């Protein structure tokens, strides 16, 4: 799960890591009243949303009057900021972070993730701050530097210095940097983070390192032992459906398309979508039942897939599972009738008595086709939509 910028800076603070002085506000009054608590302007107002590119979108501004702060807060709180990292529908702004302006001398990049290839936590540092690192990697690689934490010894200082010297830092800035490396590396391990991204790590005109902007990504799987990160989850930041699909042990994700896919197994799901859009067709989504596919799960699954209206036909593909294909076919029927499914459904049962199951779907009456085989079920779902 992702944390808001302000939440990350809070953590950073907690670990003795420099961040601009500021406050997260939930109303224009709070926003403007924060200007004084901070000091003299100009001040920086930033919408708090999980996606990036907030700058380009005008979700970040530097002002010089309580009037502007007030105006800015007034304009965004409640609205939804849409950046190049948000879906075309953007994300709600429920807090405006108001902090002090920083005298930027140079912008650096510091970040960490779990390198799947080297199977270690890797910290990256670059002199290319304020830039898409993804890009820096592409164009100028030799400007990115890495180190891997040793699971046996923990983050060591010589590593922070190595990066500091690569960045050409010297004097106190080297020690300062080494501290931030040790600090971040510790948060990463102790808080079970999946990613850290200090972009930019600023060197001020005054000559000090400060984290002007930070993005933290936590490891969902570790949340049971991360009570604090657990409480910082901001539901309003991700697609709602995905959220309920979750408590309902489903796994939703939407796409454009017109054909709804309901498969059990993330692999088979992508494979199903792939095969559908191979026979023409257009995958309207990715829904991984979860296997424990019971009748309720199937009824909920149908609701979520059909909560969207671009869906013209639903393709069910259940291979294996904990329930016998006949009981699975019933859940498909009972759900189609209850949720009052109003679309042609093409099922593809597999496993125990998929025979009897396939039949239960033919005699049901409901516009529930019962394809024979993956390849087939494809063509038929593709067919049932052609024209609409």
């Amino acid at each position: 799960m992702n944390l808001h910028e302000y939440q990350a800076k809070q953590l950073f603070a907690r670990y003795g890591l420099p961040a601009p002085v500021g406050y997260a506000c939930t109303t224009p009054r709070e926003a403007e009243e924060a200007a004084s608590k901070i000091g003299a302007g100009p001040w920086v107002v930033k919408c708090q949303v999980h996606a990036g590119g907030r700058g380009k979108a005008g979700g970040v501004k530097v002002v010089n009057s309580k009037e502007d702060i007030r105006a800015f807060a007034e304009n965004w709180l409640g609205k939804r900021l849409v950046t190049y990292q948000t879906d075309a529908n953007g994300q709600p702004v429920n807090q405006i972070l108001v902090e002090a302006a920083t005298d930027i001398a140079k912008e650096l990049y510091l970040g960490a993730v779990v390198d799947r290839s080297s199977r270690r936590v890797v910290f990256m540092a670059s002199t290319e701050g304020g830039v898409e690192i993804e890009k820096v990697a592409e164009e100028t690689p030799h400007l990115i530097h890495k180190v891997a934490l040793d699971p046996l010894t923990g983050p060591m200082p010589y590593q922070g210095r190595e990066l500091a010297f690569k960045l050409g830092l010297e004097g106190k800035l080297v020690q300062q940097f080494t501290k931030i490396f040790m600090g971040l590396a510790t948060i990463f391990l102790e808080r079970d983070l999946a990613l850290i991204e200090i972009n930019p790590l600023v060197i001020t005109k005054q000559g000090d390192l400060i984290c002007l902007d930070g993005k933290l990504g936590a490891d969902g799987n570790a949340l049971f032992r991360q009570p604090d990160l657990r409480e910082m989850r901001d539901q309003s930041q991700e697609d709602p459906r995905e959220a309920q699909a979750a408590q309902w042990e489903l796994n939703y994700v939407a796409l454009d398309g017109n054909i709804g896919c309901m498969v059990n197994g993330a692999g088979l799901a992508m494979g199903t979508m792939d095969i559908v859009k191979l026979h023409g067709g257009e995958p309207a989504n990715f829904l991984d039942v979860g296997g424990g596919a019971t009748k309720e799960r199937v009824t909920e699954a149908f609701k979520i897939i059909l909560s969207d209206d671009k869906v013209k036909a639903v393709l069910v593909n259940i291979f294996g599972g904990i329930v016998r294909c006949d009981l699975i076919a019933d859940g498909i029927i009972g759900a189609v009738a209850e949720v009052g499914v109003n679309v042609p459904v093409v099922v593809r049962l597999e496993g125990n008595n998929a025979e009897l199951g396939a039949k239960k779907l033919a005699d049901s009456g409901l516009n529930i086709i019962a394809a024979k085989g993956l390849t087939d079920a494809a063509q038929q779902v593709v067919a049932a939509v052609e024209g609409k």
């Binding site: 799947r116 290839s117 391990l189 079970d192 994700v253 995958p283």
Partner: protein, 287 residues
Amino acid sequence: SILIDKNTKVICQGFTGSQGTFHSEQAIAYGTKMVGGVTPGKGGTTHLGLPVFNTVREAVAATGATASVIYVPAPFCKDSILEAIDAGIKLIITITEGIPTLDMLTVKVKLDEAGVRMIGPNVPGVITPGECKIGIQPGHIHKPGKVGIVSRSGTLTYEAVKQTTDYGFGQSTCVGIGGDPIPGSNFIDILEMFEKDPQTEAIVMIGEIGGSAEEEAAAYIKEHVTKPVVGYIAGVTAPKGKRMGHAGAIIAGGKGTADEKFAALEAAGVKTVRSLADIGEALKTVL
């Protein structure tokens, strides 16, 4: 075949739990040599007609088992896996889903250092048709054979497993290496096995978007694998951004795309198939 066989003796950690019970019965009925299980606090009792122990060491000493299968909830796996490693077990199959990535990061180093092999976590298991079955894969869709299967996906494996059984090719051994960011074993580990295995005449490699395990397997295949390999990558229609079911499922950095992997595999000399339905055909070809 690789990893296991008729002789492999297995103990089950989290044996008295719902899933440990249910599947141990299935493995039992398939004729897998389940010699007992472990559940702290229940040592001294018998379950499914087998001895239940408090510690893995007690079980190993008592049964001489060498492989352990884990059905312990995520919050406790690091403790189960590390215990099994320390008790002498040489093959661990972790079915568990949900282990913190940092946990597996450490365990992976341990496993390596201790010369212990682990399939998983977050996997259906491993099965040698006719001989041994450790996991949750449908025993009825398999058939002793000549094709070896490796898959980052669970269900997809089944599609392939059925196809090879349907073309009467049979399976030498099925291995689900899993999804998780840092797994016990990767493609290159299992591939090097299928290669050195006489009974395996051809290989089916199933991957998906995310990471670069496949890209790395590709280079290995091209430089070390001689037997024919049919490959399939899912998630071509998957969009950048959200994770598709698994955490390693996201296609980030403009990398780890399905097409990227396909090409690399192709350039490595691997028979790729665009539709998961033609895996059987592809084999029929190369065989």
